[PDB]
Amino acid sequence: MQIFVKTLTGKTITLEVEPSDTIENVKAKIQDKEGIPPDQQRLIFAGKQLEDGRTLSDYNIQKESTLHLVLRLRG
Amino acid sequence: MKIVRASRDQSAPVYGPRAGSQCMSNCFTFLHTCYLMGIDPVLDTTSLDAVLDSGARLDAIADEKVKRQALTDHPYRLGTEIPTVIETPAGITGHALSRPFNGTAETQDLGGYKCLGILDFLTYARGKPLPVYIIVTVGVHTRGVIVARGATYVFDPHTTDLSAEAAVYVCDDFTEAISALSFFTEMIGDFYYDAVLVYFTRCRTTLISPSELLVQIMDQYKDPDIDASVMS
Numbered sequence: 001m002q003i004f005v006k007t008l009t010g011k012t013i014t015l016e017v018e019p020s021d022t023i024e025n026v027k028a029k030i031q032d033k034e035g036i037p038p039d040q041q042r043l044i045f046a047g048k049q050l051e052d053g054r055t056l057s058d059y060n061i062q063k064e065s066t067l068h069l070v071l072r073l074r075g
Numbered sequence: 076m077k078i079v080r081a082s083r084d085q086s087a088p089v090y091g092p093r094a095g096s097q098c099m100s101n102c103f104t105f106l107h108t109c110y111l112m113g114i115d116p117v118l119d120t121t122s123l124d125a126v127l128d129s130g131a132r133l134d135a136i137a138d139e140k141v142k143r144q145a146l147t148d149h150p151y152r153l154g155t156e157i158p159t160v161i162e163t164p165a166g167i168t169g170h171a172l173s174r175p176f177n178g179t180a181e182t183q184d185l186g187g188y189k190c191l192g193i194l195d196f197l198t199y200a201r202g203k204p205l206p207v208y209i210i211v212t213v214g215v216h217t218r219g220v221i222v223a224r225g226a227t228y229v230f231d232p233h234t235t236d237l238s239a240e241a242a243v244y245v246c247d248d249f250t251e252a253i254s255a256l257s258f259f260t261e262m263i264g265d266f267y268y269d270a271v272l273v274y275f276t277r278c279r280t281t282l283i284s285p286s287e288l289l290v291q292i293m294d295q296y297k298d299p300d301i302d303a304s305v306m307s
């Protein structure tokens with residue numbers, strides 16, 4: 001299924017995912033596509049930061065949902 | 076706006092192999108020293124040089140933990156990678172970090188997850204009991220920010236067009252503070268920050284566990300903005 005991931009600075013990433021994929025796996029896919037390390041990714045859906053060991057299905061994230069990607073900055 | 080300068084910046088070869096990369100630890104050491112001493116004593120060249128010296132030491136400690144834990148092999152740091160007990164000639168502090176603050180120039184509400192614009196963030200900070208201590212990163216460059224009743228202090232351990240050396244920029248208003256965070260130029264469109272408030276306590280000695288410290292600081296402040304999820 002297709003979901004959309006949008007950053008605070010406007011950029012929208014399209015991802016092919018499965019409901020049973022963990023948030024950790026989604027973060028891995030974002031690294032594979034965009035080069036952003038998982039430890040710098042905060043994924044947000046329904047007003048809440050998503051936890052790595054949970055799945056898309058745990059959060060009732062369905063086809064064509066949009067997640068927000070908030071980035072930590074290494075200084 | 077007024078400026079108080081060290082005699083060098085963080086890239087000085089005296090600071091070791093990691094000269095340049097220790098910015099975040101220099102910022103923690105700045106905030107630590109101001110919490111302990113008050114702001115006035117820290118605002119001279121001698122004291123700012125001492126901050127840089129202590130920051131290099133803290134960074135070295137942080138660097139070893141990252142390697143030992145395999146926290147990452149990236150050379151730059153996240154706040155949670157900095158030791159929460161910091162010890163210098165000024166004394167010993169423990170700290171706890173706030174929940175994440177992130178944003179652009181303007182506030183975005185992501186379905187109830189508030190990402191405050193930089194002005195709204197400083198304004199939020201100013202509603203807490205003053206002074207408030209902040210670690211703020213823009214790009215790769217970390218600064219220390221203190222929001223106090225009559226001024227906002229921005230410590231930058233790296234060179235700017237206004238100062239070759241590390242300096243504290245004494246700002247009469249948030250417009251000046253944000254200018255300092257913006258490298259004194261116009262970057263409204265590209266602006267993005269990652270910030271944590273730092274909640275300090277004075278410690279009598281260094282013999283307290285990281286978990287004990289977090290709980291103690293949570294009880295001291297009773298402020299929901301302290302990030303409890305850090306607990307391990």
Ligand SMILES: *NC[C@H](*)CC(=O)OC
Pocket residue numbers: 074075095096097098099151152215216217233
């Ligand atoms: N984030 C590391 C401190 C800043 C730096 O390395 O400047 C290049």
Ligand SMILES: [Mg+2]
Pocket residue numbers: 018
């Ligand atoms: Mg499958």
Ligand SMILES: [Mg+2]
Pocket residue numbers: 115116117118119121122
């Ligand atoms: Mg002094």
